[PDB]
Amino acid sequence: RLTERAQRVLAHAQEEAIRLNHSNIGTEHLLLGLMKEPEGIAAKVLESFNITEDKVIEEVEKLIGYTPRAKKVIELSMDEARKLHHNFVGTEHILLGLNEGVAARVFANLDLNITKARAQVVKALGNPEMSNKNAQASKSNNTLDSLARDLTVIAKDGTLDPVIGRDKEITRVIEVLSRRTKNNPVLIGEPGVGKTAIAEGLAQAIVNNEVPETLKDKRVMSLDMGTVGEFEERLKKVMEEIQQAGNVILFIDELHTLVGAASNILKPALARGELQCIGATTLDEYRKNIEKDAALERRFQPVQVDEPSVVDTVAILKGLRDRYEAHHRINISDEAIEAAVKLSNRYVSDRFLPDKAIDLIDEASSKVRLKSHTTPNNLKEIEQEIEKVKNEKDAAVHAQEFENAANLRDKQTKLEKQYEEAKNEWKNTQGMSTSLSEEDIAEVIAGWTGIPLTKINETESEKLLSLEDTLHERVIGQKDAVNSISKAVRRARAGLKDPKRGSFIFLGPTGVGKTELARALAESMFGDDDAMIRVDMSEFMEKHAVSRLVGAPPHDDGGQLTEKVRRKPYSVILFDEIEKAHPDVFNILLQVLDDGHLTDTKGRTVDFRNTIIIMTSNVGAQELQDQRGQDYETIRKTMLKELKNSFRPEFLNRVDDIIVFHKLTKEELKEIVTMMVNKLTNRLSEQNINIIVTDKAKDKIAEEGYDPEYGARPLIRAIQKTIEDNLSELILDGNQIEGKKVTV
């Protein structure tokens, strides 16, 4: 199968060739078929060498006023074409054989084959010809309504927003748009990913002739659905007006779902197999547009749009730096841009990199602008004196007195002096000129969350290594448990540890770290104590296994965890004692842990290198008591083996470690009581109460009130009345006035 040249041109010519009792198709059928008028309306590649194509055209039309000569044309053109590496014969190659389709007259205008045509062809479509359509084998070849906003004209003006690194998307769009069935590409991603810039980028490619000119007519128009009542009716009336023009196509830049105002809005109306365009969806809109319909699904091809990388986001922001500077009237630092992109990338979990980067560069810039509102005050004081003096001279002019001698003159010259002073204060006082990187960003982010803000001042030393003391002091006992855990965390530094995957099983008494450590970890690890998520096991055991992961295997069931947990991809998930978990749960944990990913019915993949799970357990009901002469490792191995005998081995094999927790000793009881003092201090030193418990009572109390598998519970009742009622008394006392440190 050849190009459409001399195939479809002929099909059209035949529609229009019903003329002369033609014994067969002659060359003149096509030749005349290659024009709109039997006039020059004359540009074949040999027109430039020796052929008066305008005369050839008149002579061929006059001639009529395959055939044996057409066959010689076909055979010669193709044979020479093969020799010249022109696999299919086009208009610039048909000349090789055009035996019939020439001014075969005395004063002839005849074609060349392997002499000049092969050279003139380079100027024609020529060298860049791999694939199979045509060269627009015609003539010169060698209503746009308000619902069709023209982007290519804006592209031509030069005011559209370019996209960095998204040529693959434009390329794929062109390929899809040309098709008959899967022919409406859609861009996939959340808005902000760069989809709006891609749609605009297409319009730019068109005006810059980076595309074959087809889009010259099939211009980028944007669809403005209009409402402020039914409007689909208008879309249909306009669509008919546009389709009749048959030139331009309507795009969605970022968002489209099925709407109630056909769910496939305007689509059966325009289901003509033409005027293909890029639609645009997100993970959920795709589902709610295309998958939801599932009929027209056969007519779409998603084009996945990734977010720009730090390098690409920085490049667009630096390119756009001039625009932002003009609006902020400040300089925006390049370092600030690099930092804004990087620090937002670390801080924001809510948006794509361009959005979180932009939100930050405007806040950093805004702060410079607020500070720069004025000259780095004394002037204002001078102005206030000027206004005062002005008012006083008003009184001076009005005074109904006998006297520019004294009243008027005094105030007039005082004002003149102050006026010069106001000007001088401005001139010799010549906020911030330019934004900063870490300093402004730390302020913006610290403002938004604070807490060293934790991803700004973290160089991965404090939360990887110093982590051991933070976690241990938060949770007293078995520092070896803590050490194993901090090692698991530091191993992920630079991806030394599998980049796409933490997991621990915590066994022991209550009040020793089985649950306490998971929260302490979230506090340190994410700079967020509420990054810890607790999951009850009965709640998801069997009948509710479907609430752990969304199922639909057998409403919009988000389960209880998939929808909610997904909102925070920076988290510690604490599972209740797993011996209460159903094998389905363990199989789920296994599937989820591998490759670090979310296994659901939505596809909202989470890079789990940003999460960790902690599962408590009491399988080692007696084994945990080995602490009461075995060391950490020996106990660990014993509990590991028993866990293996209960939970699936494959699941268990994805666990970083089995952690030994352990009843606190008196030294440890004193340490947790001490932590209470720190808590009370944090709660009250703010009532301004500083706290020291009389030493006799302090130690006696911590030493006595223990509970082997809870924490120091017996201490509690004596203390609320001994300490809290007393601290209330300190307020009512005044001897041990708040700020002093004495209690019982």
Swiss-Prot record:
Residues 66-127 are annotated as: Repeat 2. Keywords: ATP-binding, Chaperone, Nucleotide-binding, Repeat, Stress response. GO terms for biological process: cellular response to heat. Residues 1-127 form the Clp R domain. ATP binds at residues 189-196, 508-515. The keyword tRNA processing does not apply. It comes from the Bacteria. Residues 436-621 are annotated as: II. One of its GO terms (cellular component) is cytoplasm. Residues 383-418 form the UVR domain. One of its GO terms (molecular function) is ATP binding. InterPro entries: AAA+_ATPase, ATPase_AAA_core, Clp_ATPase_C, Clp_N_dom_sf, Clp_R_dom, ClpA/B, ClpA/B_CS1, ClpA/B_CS2. Residues 2-65 are annotated as: Repeat 1. Required for growth at high temperatures, probably by acting as a chaperone during heat shock and targeting heat-denatured proteins for degradation by ClpP. Belongs to the ClpA/ClpB family. ClpC subfamily. This is ATP-dependent Clp protease ATP-binding subunit ClpC. It comes from Staphylococcus aureus (strain bovine RF122 / ET3-1). The gene is clpC.
